[PDB]
Structures are given as structure tokens and as C-alpha cells.
Write a protein that binds this ligand. Structure first.
Ligand SMILES: [Cl-]
Length: 74
């Protein structure tokens, strides 16, 4: 429950609006642009890593002209 840690994201808009995605071990690697890590090991990310994934994912969402977006869990 930190300004320094973030559990995941929630989907804004679209059919899945309100759904959450909890950050996993693999997301940390993805926040570094690396493949791997366990995608089933739930764990909070350091806020900088959370932000990196936030911006990358929403850039993709507009790149792909999608109808939903991501917001960090508070
Ligand atoms: Cl980090």
C-alpha cells in the first residue's frame, strides 16, 4: 500500500471495463523490455516499473486504435 509499489492495472472502457490485471514477475522483465519471468507469480511492481508498463501499454492501445485503456490500481 505504498506510493512506491503498485499491484496492477484496471481496464477502462470496452467490454472488459473494470477488470484488473495484477502485476506478475514477468511484468517486471517486460518493464525492462526483456522476455521471461514467471507470468503466474503475482507480486507488486516498484512504481517506476509500473509507470513504464502503463505508458507502453496505452501507447500500444492507441497504436492499435483500441477502445480500452489501462489505469494503475491505486
Ligand atoms: Cl524499477
Amino acid at each position: 500500500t505504498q506510493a512506491n509499489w503498485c499491484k496492477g492495472v484496471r481496464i477502462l472502457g470496452g467490454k472488459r471495463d473494470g477488470e484488473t490485471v495484477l502485476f506478475t514477475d514477468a511484468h517486471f522483465s517486460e518493464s525492462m523490455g526483456m522476455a521471461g519471468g514467471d507470468p503466474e507469480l503475482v507480486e507488486a511492481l516498484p512504481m517506476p516499473a509500473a509507470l513504464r508498463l502503463l505508458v507502453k501499454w496505452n501507447k500500444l492501445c492507441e497504436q492499435m486504435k483500441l477502445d480500452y485503456r489501462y489505469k494503475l490500481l491505486h
